[PDB]
Short mmCIF file of C-alpha atoms in Angstrom, two decimals:
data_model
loop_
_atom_site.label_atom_id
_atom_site.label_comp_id
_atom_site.label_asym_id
_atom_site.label_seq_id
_atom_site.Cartn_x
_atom_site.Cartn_y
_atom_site.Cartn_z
CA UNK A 28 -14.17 37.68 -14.60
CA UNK A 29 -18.10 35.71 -14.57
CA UNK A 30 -20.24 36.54 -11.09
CA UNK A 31 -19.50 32.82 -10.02
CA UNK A 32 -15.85 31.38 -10.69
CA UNK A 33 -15.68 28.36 -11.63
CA UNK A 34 -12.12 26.55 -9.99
CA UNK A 35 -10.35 23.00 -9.87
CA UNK A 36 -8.02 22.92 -6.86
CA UNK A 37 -5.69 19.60 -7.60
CA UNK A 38 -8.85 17.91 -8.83
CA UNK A 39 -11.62 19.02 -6.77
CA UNK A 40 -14.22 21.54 -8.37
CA UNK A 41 -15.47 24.67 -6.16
CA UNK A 42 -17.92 27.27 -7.46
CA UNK A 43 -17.86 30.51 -5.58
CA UNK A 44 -18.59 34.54 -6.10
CA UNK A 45 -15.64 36.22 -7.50
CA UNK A 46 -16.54 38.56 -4.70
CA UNK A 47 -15.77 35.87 -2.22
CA UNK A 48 -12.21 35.51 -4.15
CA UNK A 49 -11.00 39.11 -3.87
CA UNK A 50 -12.68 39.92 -0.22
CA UNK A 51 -9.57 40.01 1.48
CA UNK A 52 -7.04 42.37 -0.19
CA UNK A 53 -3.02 41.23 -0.40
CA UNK A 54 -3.77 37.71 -0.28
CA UNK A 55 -3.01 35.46 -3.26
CA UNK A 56 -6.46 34.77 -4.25
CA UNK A 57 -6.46 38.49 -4.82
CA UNK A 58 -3.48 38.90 -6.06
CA UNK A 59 -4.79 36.06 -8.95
CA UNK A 60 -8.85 37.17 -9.04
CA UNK A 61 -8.00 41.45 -9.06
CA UNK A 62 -10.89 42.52 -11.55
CA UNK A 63 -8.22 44.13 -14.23
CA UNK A 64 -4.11 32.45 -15.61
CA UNK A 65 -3.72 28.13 -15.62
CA UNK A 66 -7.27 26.41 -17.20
CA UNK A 67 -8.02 22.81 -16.65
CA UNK A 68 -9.30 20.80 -19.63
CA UNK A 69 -12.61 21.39 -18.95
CA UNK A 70 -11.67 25.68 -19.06
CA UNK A 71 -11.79 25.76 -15.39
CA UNK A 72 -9.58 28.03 -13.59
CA UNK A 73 -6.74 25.79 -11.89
CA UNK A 74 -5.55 25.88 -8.48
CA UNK A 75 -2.00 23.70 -7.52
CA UNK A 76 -3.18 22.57 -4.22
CA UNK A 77 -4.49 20.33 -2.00
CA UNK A 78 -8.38 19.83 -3.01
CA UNK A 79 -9.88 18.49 -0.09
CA UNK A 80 -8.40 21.58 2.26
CA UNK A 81 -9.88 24.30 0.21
CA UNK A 82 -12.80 23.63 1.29
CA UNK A 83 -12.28 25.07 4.50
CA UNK A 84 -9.92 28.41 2.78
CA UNK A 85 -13.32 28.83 0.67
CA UNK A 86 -15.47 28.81 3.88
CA UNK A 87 -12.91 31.23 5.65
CA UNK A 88 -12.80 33.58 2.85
CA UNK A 89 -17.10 33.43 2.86
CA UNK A 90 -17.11 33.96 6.76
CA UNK A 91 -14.23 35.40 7.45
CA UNK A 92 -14.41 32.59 10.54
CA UNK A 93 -14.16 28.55 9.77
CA UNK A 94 -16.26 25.92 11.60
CA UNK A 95 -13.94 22.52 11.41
CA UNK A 96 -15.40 18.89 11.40
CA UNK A 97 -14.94 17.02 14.95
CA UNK A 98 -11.55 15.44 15.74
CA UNK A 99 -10.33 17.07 12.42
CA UNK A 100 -6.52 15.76 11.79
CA UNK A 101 -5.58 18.20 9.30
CA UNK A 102 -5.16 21.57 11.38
CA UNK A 103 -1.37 21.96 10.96
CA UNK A 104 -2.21 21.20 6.67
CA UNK A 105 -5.02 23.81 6.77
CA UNK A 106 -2.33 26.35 8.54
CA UNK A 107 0.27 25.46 5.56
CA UNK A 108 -2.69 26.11 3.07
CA UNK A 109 -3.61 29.93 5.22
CA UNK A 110 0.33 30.66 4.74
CA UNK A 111 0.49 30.04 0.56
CA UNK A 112 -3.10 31.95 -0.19
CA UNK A 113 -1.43 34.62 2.23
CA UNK A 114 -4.47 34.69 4.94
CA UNK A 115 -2.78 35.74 7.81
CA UNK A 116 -6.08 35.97 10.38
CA UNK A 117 -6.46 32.35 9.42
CA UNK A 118 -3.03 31.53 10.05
CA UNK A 119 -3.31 33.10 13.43
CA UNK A 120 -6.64 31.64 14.06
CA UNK A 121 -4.74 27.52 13.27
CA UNK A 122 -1.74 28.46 15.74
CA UNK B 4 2.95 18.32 -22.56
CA UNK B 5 -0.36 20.38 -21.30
CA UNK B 6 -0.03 22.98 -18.68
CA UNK B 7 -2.47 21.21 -16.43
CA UNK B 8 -1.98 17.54 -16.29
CA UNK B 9 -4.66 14.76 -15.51
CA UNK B 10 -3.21 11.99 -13.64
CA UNK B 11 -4.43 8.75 -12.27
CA UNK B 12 -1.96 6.94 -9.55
CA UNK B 13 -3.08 3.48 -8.61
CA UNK B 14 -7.10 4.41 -9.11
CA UNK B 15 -6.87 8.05 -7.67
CA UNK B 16 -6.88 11.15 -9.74
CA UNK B 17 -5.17 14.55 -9.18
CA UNK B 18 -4.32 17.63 -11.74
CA UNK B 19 -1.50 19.44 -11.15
CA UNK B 20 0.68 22.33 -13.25
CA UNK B 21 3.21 19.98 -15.77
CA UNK B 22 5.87 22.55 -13.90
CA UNK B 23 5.18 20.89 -10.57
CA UNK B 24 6.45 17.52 -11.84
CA UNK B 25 9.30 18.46 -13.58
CA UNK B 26 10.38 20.85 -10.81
CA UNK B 27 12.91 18.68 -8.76
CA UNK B 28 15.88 17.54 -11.40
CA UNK B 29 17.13 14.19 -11.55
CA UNK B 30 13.75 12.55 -9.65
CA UNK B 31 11.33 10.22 -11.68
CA UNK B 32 8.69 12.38 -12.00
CA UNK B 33 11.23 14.81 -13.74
CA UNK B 34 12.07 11.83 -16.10
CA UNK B 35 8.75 10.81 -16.89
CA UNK B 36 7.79 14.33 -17.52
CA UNK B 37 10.63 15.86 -19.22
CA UNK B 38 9.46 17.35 -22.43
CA UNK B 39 11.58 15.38 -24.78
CA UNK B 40 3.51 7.31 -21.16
CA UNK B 41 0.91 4.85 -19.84
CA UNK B 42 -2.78 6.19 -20.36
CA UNK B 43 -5.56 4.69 -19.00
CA UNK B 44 -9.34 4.41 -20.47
CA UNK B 45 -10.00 7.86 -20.45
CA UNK B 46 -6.89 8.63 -21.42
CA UNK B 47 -5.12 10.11 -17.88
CA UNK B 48 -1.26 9.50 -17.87
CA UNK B 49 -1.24 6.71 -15.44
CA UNK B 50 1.21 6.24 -12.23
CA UNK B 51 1.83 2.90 -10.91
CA UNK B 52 1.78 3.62 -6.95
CA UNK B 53 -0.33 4.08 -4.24
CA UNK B 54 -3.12 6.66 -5.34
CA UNK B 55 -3.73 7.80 -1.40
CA UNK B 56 0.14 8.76 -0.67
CA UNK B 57 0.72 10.99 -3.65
CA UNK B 58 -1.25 13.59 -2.12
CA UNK B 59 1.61 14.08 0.12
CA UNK B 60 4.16 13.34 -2.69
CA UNK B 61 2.33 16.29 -4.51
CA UNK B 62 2.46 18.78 -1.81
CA UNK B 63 6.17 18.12 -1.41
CA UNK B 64 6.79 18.92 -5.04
CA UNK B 65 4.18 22.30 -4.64
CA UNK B 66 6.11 23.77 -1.61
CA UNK B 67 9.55 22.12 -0.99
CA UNK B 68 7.52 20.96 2.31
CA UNK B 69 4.85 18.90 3.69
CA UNK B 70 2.69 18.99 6.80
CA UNK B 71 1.12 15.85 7.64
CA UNK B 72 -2.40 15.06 9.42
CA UNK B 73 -2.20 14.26 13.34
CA UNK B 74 -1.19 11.27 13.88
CA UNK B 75 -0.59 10.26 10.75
CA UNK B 76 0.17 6.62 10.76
CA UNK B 77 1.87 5.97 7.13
CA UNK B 78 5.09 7.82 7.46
CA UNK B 79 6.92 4.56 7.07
CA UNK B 80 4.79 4.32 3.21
CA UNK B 81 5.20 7.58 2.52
CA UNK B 82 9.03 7.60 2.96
CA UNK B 83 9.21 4.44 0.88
CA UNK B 84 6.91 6.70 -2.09
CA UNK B 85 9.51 9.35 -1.86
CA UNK B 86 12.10 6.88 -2.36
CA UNK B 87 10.60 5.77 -5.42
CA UNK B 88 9.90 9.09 -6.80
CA UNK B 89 13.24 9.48 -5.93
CA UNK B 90 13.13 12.67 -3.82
CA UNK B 91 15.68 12.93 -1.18
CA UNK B 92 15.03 15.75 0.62
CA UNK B 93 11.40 14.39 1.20
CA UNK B 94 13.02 11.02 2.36
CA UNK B 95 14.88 13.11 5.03
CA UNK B 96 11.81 15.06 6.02
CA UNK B 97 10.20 11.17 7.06
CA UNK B 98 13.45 9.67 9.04
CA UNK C 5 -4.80 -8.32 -25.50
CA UNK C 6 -4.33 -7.28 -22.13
CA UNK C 7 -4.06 -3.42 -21.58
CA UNK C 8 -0.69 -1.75 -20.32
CA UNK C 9 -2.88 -0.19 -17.69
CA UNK C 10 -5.51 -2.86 -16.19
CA UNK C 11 -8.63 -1.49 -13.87
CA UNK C 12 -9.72 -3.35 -11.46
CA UNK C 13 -12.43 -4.35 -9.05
CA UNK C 14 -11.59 -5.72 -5.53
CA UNK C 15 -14.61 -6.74 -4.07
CA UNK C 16 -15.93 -3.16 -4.65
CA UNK C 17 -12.51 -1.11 -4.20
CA UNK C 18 -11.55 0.12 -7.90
CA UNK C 19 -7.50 -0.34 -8.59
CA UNK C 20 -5.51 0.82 -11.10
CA UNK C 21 -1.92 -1.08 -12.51
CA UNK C 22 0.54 -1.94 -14.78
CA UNK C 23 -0.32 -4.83 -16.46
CA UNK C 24 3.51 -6.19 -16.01
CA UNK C 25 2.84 -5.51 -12.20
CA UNK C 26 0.00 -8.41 -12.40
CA UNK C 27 2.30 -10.98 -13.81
CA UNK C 28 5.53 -9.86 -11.79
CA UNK C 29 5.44 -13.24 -9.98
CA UNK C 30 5.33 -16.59 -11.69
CA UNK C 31 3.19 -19.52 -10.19
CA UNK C 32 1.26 -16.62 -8.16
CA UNK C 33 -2.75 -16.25 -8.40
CA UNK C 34 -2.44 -13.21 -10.33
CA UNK C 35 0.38 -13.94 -12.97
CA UNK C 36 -1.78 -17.40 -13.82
CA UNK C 37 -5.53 -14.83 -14.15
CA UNK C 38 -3.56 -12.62 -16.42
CA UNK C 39 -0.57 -14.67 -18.71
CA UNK C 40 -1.48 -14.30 -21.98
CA UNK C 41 -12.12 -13.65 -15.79
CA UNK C 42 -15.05 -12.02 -14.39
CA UNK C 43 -16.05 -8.78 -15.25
CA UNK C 44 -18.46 -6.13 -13.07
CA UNK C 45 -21.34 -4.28 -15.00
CA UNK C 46 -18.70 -1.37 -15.61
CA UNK C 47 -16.40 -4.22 -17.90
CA UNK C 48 -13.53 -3.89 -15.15
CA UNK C 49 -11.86 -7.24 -14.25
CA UNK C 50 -12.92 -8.40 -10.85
CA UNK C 51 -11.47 -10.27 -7.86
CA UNK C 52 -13.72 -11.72 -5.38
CA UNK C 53 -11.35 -10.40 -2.56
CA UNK C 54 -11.50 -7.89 0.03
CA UNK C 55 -11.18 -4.53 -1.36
CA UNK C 56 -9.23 -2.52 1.77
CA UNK C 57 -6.68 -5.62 1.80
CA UNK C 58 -5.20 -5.34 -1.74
CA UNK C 59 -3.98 -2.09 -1.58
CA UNK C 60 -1.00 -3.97 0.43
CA UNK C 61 -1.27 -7.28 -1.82
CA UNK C 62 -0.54 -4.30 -4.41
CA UNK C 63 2.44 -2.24 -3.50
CA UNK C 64 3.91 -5.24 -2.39
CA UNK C 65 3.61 -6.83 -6.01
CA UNK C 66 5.15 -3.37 -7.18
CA UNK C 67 8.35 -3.26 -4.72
CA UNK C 68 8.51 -7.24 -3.43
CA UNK C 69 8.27 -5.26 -0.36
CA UNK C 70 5.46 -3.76 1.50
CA UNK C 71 5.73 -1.04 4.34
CA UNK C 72 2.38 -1.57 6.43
CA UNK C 73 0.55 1.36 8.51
CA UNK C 74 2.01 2.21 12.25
CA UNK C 75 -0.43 0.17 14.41
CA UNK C 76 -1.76 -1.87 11.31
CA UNK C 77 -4.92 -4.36 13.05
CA UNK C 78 -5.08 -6.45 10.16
CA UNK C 79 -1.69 -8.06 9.36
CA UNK C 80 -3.76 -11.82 9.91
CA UNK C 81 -6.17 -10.89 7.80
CA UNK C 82 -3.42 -9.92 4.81
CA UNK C 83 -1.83 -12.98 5.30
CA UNK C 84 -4.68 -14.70 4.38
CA UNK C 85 -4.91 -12.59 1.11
CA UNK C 86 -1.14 -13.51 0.48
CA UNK C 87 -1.81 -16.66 0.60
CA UNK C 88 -5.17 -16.65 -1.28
CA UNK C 89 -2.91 -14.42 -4.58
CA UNK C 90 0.12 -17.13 -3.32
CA UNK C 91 2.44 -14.74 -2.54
CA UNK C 92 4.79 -17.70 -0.25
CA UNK C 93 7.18 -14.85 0.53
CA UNK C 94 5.11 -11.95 1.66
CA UNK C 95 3.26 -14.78 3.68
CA UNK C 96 6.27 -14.99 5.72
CA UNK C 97 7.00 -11.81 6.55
CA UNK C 98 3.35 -11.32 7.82
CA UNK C 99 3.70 -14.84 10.04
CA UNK C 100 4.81 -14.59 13.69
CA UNK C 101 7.29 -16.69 15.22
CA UNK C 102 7.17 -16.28 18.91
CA UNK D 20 -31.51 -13.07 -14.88
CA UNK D 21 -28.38 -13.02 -11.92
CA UNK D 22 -25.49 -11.33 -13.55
CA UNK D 23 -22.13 -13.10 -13.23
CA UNK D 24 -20.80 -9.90 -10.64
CA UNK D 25 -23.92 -9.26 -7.80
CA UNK D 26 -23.49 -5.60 -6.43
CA UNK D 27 -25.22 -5.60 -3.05
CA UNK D 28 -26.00 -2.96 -0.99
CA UNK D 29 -25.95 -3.91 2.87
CA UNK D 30 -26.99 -1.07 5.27
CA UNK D 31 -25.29 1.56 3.32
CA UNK D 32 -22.27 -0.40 2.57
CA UNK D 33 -21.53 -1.57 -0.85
CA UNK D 34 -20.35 -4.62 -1.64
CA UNK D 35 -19.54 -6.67 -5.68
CA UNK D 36 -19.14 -10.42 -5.36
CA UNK D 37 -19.32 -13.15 -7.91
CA UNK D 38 -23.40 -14.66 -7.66
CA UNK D 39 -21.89 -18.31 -7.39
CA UNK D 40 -20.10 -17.19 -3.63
CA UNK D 41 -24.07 -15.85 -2.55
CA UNK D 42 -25.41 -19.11 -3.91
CA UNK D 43 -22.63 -21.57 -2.98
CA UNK D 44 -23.99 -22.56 0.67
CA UNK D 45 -27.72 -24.51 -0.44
CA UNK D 46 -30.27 -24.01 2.19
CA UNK D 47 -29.15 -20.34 3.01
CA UNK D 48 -30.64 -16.88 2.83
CA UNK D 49 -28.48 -15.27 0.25
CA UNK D 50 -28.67 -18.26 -1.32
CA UNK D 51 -32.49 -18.43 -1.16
CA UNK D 52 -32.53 -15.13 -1.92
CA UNK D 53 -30.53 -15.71 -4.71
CA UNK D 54 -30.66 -19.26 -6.05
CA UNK D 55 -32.00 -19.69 -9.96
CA UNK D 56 -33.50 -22.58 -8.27
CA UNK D 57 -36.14 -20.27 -7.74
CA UNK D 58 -37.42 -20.50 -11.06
CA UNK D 59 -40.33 -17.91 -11.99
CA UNK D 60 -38.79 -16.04 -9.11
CA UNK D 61 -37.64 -12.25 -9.06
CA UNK D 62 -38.60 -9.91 -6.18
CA UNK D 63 -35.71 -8.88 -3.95
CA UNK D 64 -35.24 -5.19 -2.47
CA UNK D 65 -33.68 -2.67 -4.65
CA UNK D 66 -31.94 0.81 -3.58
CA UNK D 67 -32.31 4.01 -5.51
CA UNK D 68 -29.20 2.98 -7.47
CA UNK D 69 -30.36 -0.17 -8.92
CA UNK D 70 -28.39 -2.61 -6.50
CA UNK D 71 -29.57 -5.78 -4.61
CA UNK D 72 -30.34 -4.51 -0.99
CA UNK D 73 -29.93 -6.45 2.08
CA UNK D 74 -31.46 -4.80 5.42
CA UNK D 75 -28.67 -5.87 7.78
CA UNK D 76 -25.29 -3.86 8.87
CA UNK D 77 -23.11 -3.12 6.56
CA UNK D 78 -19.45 -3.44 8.35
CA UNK D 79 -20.45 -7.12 9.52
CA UNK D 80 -21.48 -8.52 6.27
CA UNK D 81 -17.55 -8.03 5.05
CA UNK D 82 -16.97 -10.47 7.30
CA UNK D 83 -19.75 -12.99 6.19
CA UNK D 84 -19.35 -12.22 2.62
CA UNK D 85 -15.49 -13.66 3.36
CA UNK D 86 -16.46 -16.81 5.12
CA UNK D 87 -18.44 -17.39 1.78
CA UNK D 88 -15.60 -16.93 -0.23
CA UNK D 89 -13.02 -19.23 1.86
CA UNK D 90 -15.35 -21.32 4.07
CA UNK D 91 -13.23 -19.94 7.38
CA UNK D 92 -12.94 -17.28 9.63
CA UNK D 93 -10.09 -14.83 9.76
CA UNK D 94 -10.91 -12.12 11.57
CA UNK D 95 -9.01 -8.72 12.46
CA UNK D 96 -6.66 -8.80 15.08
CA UNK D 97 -8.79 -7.59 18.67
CA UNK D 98 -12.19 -8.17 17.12
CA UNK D 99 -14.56 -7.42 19.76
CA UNK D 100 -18.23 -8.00 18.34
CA UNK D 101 -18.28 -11.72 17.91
CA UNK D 102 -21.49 -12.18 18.83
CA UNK D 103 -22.97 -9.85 16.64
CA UNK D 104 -21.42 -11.66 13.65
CA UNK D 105 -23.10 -15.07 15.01
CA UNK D 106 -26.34 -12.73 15.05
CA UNK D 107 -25.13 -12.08 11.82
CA UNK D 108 -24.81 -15.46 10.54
CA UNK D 109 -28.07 -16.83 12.34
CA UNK D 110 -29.81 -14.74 9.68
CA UNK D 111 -28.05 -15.46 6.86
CA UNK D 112 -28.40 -19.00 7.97
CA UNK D 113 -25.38 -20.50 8.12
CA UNK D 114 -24.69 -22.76 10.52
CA UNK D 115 -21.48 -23.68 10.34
CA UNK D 116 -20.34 -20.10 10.50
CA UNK D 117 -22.07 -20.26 13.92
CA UNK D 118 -20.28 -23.37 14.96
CA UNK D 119 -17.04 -21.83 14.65
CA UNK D 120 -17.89 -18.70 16.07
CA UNK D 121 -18.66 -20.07 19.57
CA UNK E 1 -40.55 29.16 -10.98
CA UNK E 2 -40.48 25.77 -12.43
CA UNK E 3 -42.04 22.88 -9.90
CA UNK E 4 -38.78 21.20 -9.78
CA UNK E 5 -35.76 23.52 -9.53
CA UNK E 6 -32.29 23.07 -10.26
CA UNK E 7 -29.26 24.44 -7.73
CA UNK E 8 -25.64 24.66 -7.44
CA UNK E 9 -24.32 25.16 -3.95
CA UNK E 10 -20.75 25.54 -4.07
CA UNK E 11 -19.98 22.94 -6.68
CA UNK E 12 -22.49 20.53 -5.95
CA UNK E 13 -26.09 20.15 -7.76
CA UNK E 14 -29.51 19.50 -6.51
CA UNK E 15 -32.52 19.27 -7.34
CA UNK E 16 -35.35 19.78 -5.30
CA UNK E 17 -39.42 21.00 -5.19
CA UNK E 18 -39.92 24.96 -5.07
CA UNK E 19 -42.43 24.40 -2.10
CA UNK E 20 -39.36 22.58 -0.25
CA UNK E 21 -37.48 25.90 -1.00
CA UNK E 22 -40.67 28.01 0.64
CA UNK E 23 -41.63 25.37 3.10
CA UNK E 24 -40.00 27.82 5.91
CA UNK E 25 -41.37 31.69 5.65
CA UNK E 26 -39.06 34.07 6.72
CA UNK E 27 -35.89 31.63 6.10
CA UNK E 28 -33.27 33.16 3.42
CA UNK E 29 -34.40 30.46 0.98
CA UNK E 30 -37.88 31.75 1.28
CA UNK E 31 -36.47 35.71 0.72
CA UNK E 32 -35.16 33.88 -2.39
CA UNK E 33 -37.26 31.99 -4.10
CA UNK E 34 -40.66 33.62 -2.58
CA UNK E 35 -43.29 34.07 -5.45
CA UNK E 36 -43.05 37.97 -6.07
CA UNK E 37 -30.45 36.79 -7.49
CA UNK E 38 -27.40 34.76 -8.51
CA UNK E 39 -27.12 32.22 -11.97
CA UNK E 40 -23.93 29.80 -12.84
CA UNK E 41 -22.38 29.58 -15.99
CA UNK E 42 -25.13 26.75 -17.00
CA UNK E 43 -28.06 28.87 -16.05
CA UNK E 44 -28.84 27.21 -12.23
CA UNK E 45 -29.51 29.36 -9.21
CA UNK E 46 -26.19 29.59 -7.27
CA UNK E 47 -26.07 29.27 -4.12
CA UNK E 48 -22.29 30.07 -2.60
CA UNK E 49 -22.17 27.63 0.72
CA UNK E 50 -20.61 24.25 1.45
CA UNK E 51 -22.36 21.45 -1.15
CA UNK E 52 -22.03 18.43 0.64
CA UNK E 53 -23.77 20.22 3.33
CA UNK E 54 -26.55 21.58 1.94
CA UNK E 55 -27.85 18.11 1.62
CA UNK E 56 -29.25 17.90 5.29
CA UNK E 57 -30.38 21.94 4.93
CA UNK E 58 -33.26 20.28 2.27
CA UNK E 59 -34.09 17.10 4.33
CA UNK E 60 -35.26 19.67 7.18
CA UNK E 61 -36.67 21.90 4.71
CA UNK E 62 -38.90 18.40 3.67
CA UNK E 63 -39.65 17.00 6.98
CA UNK E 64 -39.34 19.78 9.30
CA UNK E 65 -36.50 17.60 11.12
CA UNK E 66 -33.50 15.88 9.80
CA UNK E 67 -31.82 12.50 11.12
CA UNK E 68 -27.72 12.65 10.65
CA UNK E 69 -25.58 9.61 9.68
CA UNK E 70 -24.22 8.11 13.19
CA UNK E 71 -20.63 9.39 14.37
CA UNK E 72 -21.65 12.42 12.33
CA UNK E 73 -18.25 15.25 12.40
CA UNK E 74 -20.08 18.23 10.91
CA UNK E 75 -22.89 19.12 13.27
CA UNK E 76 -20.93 22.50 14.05
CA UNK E 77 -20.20 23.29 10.06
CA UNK E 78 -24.25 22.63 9.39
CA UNK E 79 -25.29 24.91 12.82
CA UNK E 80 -23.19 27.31 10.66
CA UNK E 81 -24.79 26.45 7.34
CA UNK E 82 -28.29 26.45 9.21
CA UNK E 83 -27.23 30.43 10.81
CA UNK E 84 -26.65 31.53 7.19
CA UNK E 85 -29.98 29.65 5.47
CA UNK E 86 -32.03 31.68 9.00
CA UNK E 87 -33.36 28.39 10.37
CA UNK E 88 -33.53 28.94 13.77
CA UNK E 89 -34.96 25.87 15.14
CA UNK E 90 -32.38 23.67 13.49
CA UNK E 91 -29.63 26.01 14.71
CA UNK E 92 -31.31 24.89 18.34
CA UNK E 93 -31.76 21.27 17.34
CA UNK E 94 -28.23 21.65 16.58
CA UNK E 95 -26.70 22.94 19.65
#
């Protein structure tokens, strides 16, 4: 795996450190990114989910806390999105 | 069919796994998908619907589930989507 | 031709249909613009029309039925797009009786 | 030079209407601004993007740019800032527009 | 360093002067792009944050303050953003 992953989550592209994808072991993105897969198009490594959410997974998994915009409706969405990439500190931090 | 598909519905575009819309049996997307279509200019399959709503219509078919935003104020769309997609479970879900 | 798939431009709102779903009802605006027209700087077909409305003016051309937001502030303002596309039916269901 | 499609950009917001709606009411601003009548002609503002911009709010102008379009007034249901859309069309100069908002 | 250099921060590209970068000694830009790190797949310095915030991070690297757009949701994300880039004044301006 390249330094900086390139990835297309349901049609939104993120660039992040592969480090960033594997920092938190058992979790799916670790499970996927382990140093030892679906491509867009465009050879991108492709995520099936919600675009606009990751976002806030990606700034999670690069601060191990996330800062969420004011009066942000999509808490209980952002929870469901914690429970598939397996981040269970996140999860607890939504509830 | 491509393992990652580029779709435009009504003016918005999402990618998603080809698995993801043939995953529910016997629903539209299933039909239009089967392996066994409508492209617009730059040659995305095209969908006929509201492009805002199949974001929800998209996470159904990803997790057999969908959490909606707070306060969300087109349930009353969104269950008339699912009835077109023809997924009954999801139609259910928004009674 | 036409294209199966027309884009379009709304008063700056970009849409995306069918071109069957234009000409779905006969005598109305849109079935007399495209039986077989502007164009923006991009080529796509536009509609001097307010962009935010025609999303509605839209699905309701694709189900003869439209399901409007919980709490929706501009059904007035719809109406008056209904009747601008002439779309006599969906003009009644947005009129109040009282 | 006017193309047939004007993209405007009003305070932020953009806006594409046909150049005959901004030039349909004679004696105007937009139609000042943008009458051939002008003849020699060219200078209006310009944002970074190339489009015609107009130094006014953005949100109103949807509202002005309609009355242009139908020569009436439908408004959203519990619109509170009428008088800033009469501000609105004082500038613009169209006084009809102010007639029927009062 | 060239006079005008190019950046990817999280998915998102800029472009900006090197004495914008510099413009705050001591600041983790600075540390970075100081006179005596991380590349993307296309060769630009990669910088693994939130894009579409790093916009108002170079507007008070130019001007020493930064206006936000009214009704602005993300002053808490970019107090984060401005934590991580070690500007401590806009962290205060922020608070």
């Amino acid at each position: 795996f390249p330094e900086v992953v390139e990835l297309n989550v349901g049609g939104q592209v993120y660039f992040t450190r592969h480090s960033t994808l594997i920092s938190i072991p058992h979790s799916l993105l670790w499970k996927m990114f382990s140093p030892k897969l679906a491509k867009d198009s465009k050879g991108r490594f492709f995520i099936d989910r919600d675009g606009f959410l990751f976002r806030y997974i990606l700034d999670y998994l690069r601060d191990r806390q996330v800062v969420l915009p004011d009066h942000f409706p999509e808490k209980g969405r952002l929870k469901r999105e914690a429970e598939y990439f397996q981040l269970p500190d996140l999860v607890k931090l939504l509830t």
